[PDB]
Symmetry: D2
Subunit: 380 residues, 4 copies
């Protein structure tokens, strides 16, 4: 057992699962077909208190601790990875508004983030730069009471639905070092000069509305600056600890789900007068998967505890992110293979789980970037 969950979280998990059993599980395949999860689902999430529950009661939130977010994100992954946009809204983007927003900004935005009237996104990555974030070239040039924004952002989660987009841009492209010229600017829906691409066709996460964003002389009120000019990089580096933790949590859950699928399948499939689960190689493969899952679960649970205690754990979250995502990828490969021909059929859930997992090694920072961060912390 992990110490961050108490009885209240256990009853919450059951209540949230009951909601999903009606609203998510039976609808998920249709959402994938359409390429997007309907706004009405977010509205239902908001009215039931499952959006931004950590937000203060004065904005309509529940003052919930981070364990509630762990439960939400785990239960949503149990449905499917296309639901990652909720965890992104809850635990990645809206915390920027709460941490760095003025009272006026928080009052204006947070209540609607809780209800789901405003859906959020964060836009860092550009065609020319992802891992090398200091090299982004989207510019925001001050002109009167406005920032004139020019640039392109790519692979944006919630790219179609998002009404509020936290945009990383260069307010001073000539700054030394380059990262000191970066600022965070909130871009609202229907901003003149702000357009969106058609939803991106991807290997998986088919129900996630990933899209490119285009800023052609985007006229953004100066009021929409989040925090201080030229400190944008610092806000990002700070919040990426929670971001990477969220990815680690979702990948751990995905592995657990895929293991359960495989175990159940091989226990019911017969070959050569035996259940497939009776062959020693199958037993050992499952034992090895179970072991690695136990390791990842124990580690991520410890990192959650450290995080909740307010401790700085850059190294450990980077470890959790790369290792658990690779582990879940290995689980997926084993799972497909152990299903035989059926693991390659879209009628079987494992096919979708398999297509969904490998991107976890790429986003929130590639696993190569995680190893880079670890090596830096090792002092070499």
């Amino acid at each position: 057992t992990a110490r961050y969950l108490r009885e209240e979280h256990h009853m919450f998990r059951a209540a949230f699962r009951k909601f999903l059993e009606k609203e998510a599980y039976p609808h998920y395949n249709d959402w994938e077909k359409r390429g997007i999860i309907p706004r009405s689902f977010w509205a239902k999430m908001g009215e039931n208190g499952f959006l931004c529950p950590w937000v203060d009661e004065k904005y309509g939130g529940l003052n919930a601790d981070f364990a509630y977010s762990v439960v939400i994100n785990e239960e949503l992954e149990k449905v499917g990875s296309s639901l990652v946009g909720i965890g992104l809204h809850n635990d990645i983007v809206t915390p920027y508004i709460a941490s760095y927003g003025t009272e006026e900004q928080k009052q204006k935005w947070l209540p609607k983030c809780v209800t789901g009237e405003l859906i959020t996104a964060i836009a860092m990555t550009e065609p020319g730069a992802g891992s090398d974030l200091a090299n982004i070239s989207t510019t925001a040039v001050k002109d009167g009471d406005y920032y004139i924004v020019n640039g392109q952002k790519t692979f944006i989660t919630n790219g179609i639905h998002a009404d509020l987009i936290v945009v990383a841009c260069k307010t001073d492209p000539q700054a030394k070092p380059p990262h000191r010229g970066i600022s965070l600017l909130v871009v609202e829906r229907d901003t003149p000069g702000f357009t969106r691409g058609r939803k991106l066709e991807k290997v998986g996460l088919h129900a996630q509305d990933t899209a490119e964003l285009f800023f052609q002389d985007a006229k953004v009120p100066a009021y929409n600056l989040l925090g201080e000019e030229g400190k944008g990089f610092y806000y990002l580096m700070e919040k990426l600890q929670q971001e990477r933790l969220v990815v680690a949590i979702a990948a751990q859950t995905a592995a657990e789900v895929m293991f359960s699928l495989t175990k159940q399948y091989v226990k019911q499939r017969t070959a050569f007068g035996k259940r497939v689960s009776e062959f020693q190689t199958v037993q050992f493969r499952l034992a090895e998967m179970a072991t690695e899952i136990a390791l990842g679960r124990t580690f991520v649970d410890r990192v959650i505890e450290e995080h909740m205690a307010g401790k700085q754990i850059v190294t450990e979250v980077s470890m959790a992110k790369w290792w658990i995502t690779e582990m879940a990828k290995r689980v997926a490969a084993e799972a497909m293979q152990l299903h035989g021909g059926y693991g390659y059929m879209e009628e079987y859930e494992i096919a979708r789980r398999y297509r969904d997992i490998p991107v976890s090694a790429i986003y929130a920072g590639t696993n190569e970037m995680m190893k880079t961060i670890i090596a830096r912390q090792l002092d070499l």
Copy 2:
């Protein structure tokens, strides 16, 4: 060492054909879920179908190296073209090896032209790896066989006009495998129906389907070889089947390596080509090494096979190891493209989805290891 100048010239000419007839259309075929029969017709009229078939049926008496070239060049277009290799090098050889003079005359000419596309149906919902435990029955009611059963995952399952079906003509054979025969089932057989095109992770243009036999009336002269010797024919032909899969997986690995190398050489980050970071260099060096090992091994197996030698162990080794290697290449390739590796606009995404099934068909990699272990005594 099995490729002579004639094969190099043929490769260039076949590639030119595909640059016109296949490469520009592949993405459309995938969207359609099938490769049009018109393409098969163009392949047939140009002599690219069953080239090994004797000239007397309209073939070219081509050696196996021509089939290697064709299958490799088709994979470089994409894995959904595996149906042609299956027609050419898996199924039609059953007709030539075990067909009567009369069956060969009736069927082989049209297989060369592509008027008849072939398929082979072994696997059932209840049994794949455990092939001896198939339950599809063919009961004589002269001069017909009455066939009952279901076959699953059939390549060319929609297009196929001739299907070689493994069935139990004596379900009480003891030992069970002794009751297996091969029966050719023709398009428009009464009681023979097909399922919808299967929705798969990849091979989107390959028409895989289930087949259904409900008191299907099959003429007794459609028996292939002798009653009760079907299992023996299958074990015999599975060596070339496994070789074909190994060749295609080897080619897929090479294609994916090339895509990845080109990408990382053009992509820059932190003031360098991605290909300049030492970890990327070593990963590419390791991929290049395993690719070279697979190429050398499969080439030697091809040579042995063409020499008429029994290669059961070696082909089983090639099949499992090369398919697993190709899978590892795919995983490296997606990762090294970053977000772009996950985008369907990039070819690597499709290559990635296509590869993992190679570890499953022609017999699972677990079955390959089972065979190797048996041969190790």
Copy 3:
């Protein structure tokens, strides 16, 4: 941080390390040359309270909790794996006497186990059976007030020094199932018919006195029966949880030691105008080793906590044992390679660490047996 260590354990670790810095570290290489650790070392351990510290004060012990044993075994491994005989005495064998001994037996044996006047060993494995323990063939036939013992035991840790040997033997060879015929019998030094082989030449653990034991009509007092006849297998299965945990702890420490050796080496070695630690492949290899070490440490620490709480964790300890031992083997292989030619030289400590590690995957139950146990617990 792991919750089982308090300030008292931290001061204890420092005190114990101070003892070892004088008595163990500088002598270790000589012990390996001789093939045995001198009795005088055990005597020093006993007089300083470092043997069987968990034993009750009434037998001369300290009533120490298991965290003291964790510290002792970790610190001894930091010296070298040839010191495993101490952890075996402390935490594997003597607990059998405390758990299953009569008051008379405990009074007779435990005080001298604390002082080191009696060194203990456990003898299960035979030439014909190790993994398949139910198939042991050493017999003990009752004759008057004695058991007549015939058989051979192999690979016995503390095989030369041991004065008390807990011997698994068949008191009823015809029993059904075979395991119901197994009993534990304490064999004392100078028992008529009991002899020992020459110390076994091994790949590593060169200072550990591993030997075969021979029983040719060994005349053992019936008083020396430990527990109940035919329940021997049950005692063994019960105590193997702690045994496997001890092995996992030592392997985790060995990995940590080997990592430190490698990191320090590559940081000081120059090639191509750079420190070796500056090449990206070296950085990533170290980052990967660091990650896996962090996983093993977090997991074993959690298992220690569960164990100390009195919980039954057969699955988790089997996971810890196989995965950590394999991980430490991988660490060792990386460490040798990263030292270049120097990693193959016996003058460098890594050579010895490398030779010492791979046996951890074999003893206390092979890693194949660990996977067997896990699969059984998965219900397949």
Copy 4:
């Protein structure tokens, strides 16, 4: 395909020789820390040293396949015999390729007989992988070179009567590698001393030592080739060096596989042979597969090498991949023997200790990947 009947007959005869002169004595040699010169003498008198050397110096003009047979058969005895392969196929070829007519006449006859045992000294305490950064100097003081420096890890370091030493005859060469020459240093050179036999994890009968030069007086006619072209000679010869290592590692893998297979087939547990448990079967199938891949690859490299083709990439691939594979085989072998794998009475223990150094010498596996990456462009 490089072995003809003559080579098969030779293999049998050489093995017979070793069954008498080597196998029964190997464990004793290991205890002694050296292979006696008497064995070298028996090898020489039977024509098993430098067989490729022209008949005019007393050699046999044997092709490289004879060296393959010798090195393989010696490894089947044990890895401490690598000094012979080093003499035959690594060092003496420097004398034949770059020696003047007069040096060849002076040295090659005695290398064939074994009167002179050879060694090559590249590596220094401060530089191994980074060979261009060697600091051993050879300064002309006609008609001598005055040599100062230290060489480390020298195979045949005790026995060697001739040592080919890489040194800087112009330490200000810019570019540095242009100042490297090869200088033959003879036994009993003034100022030339040797360290104690190095204590190693394995290769216990191989006499590895450090060499010390303190104003060593070396005759100028002991220069091998031209001044400042030493680096070029080394890069040229390292292809055969790396091939020799790959061959020995391949053979070690095969030996260890055979030991393991035999053990698990004779050992029983839980009412079955250990070899009957499915996980053991699959592990052995995987080992057999990788061994087959390595054998096929190294055999093809040997063929290419004998054809006189440049094989830099391929040999680097063979060296790193096969040594890593052999290491994996060793780890599997110890585990599958249980406790017995850890006992020095069992041959597998020694094989296990011997193998990992193959990933280090002839250039580290990291250097092999560096070379491959460079060739990938």
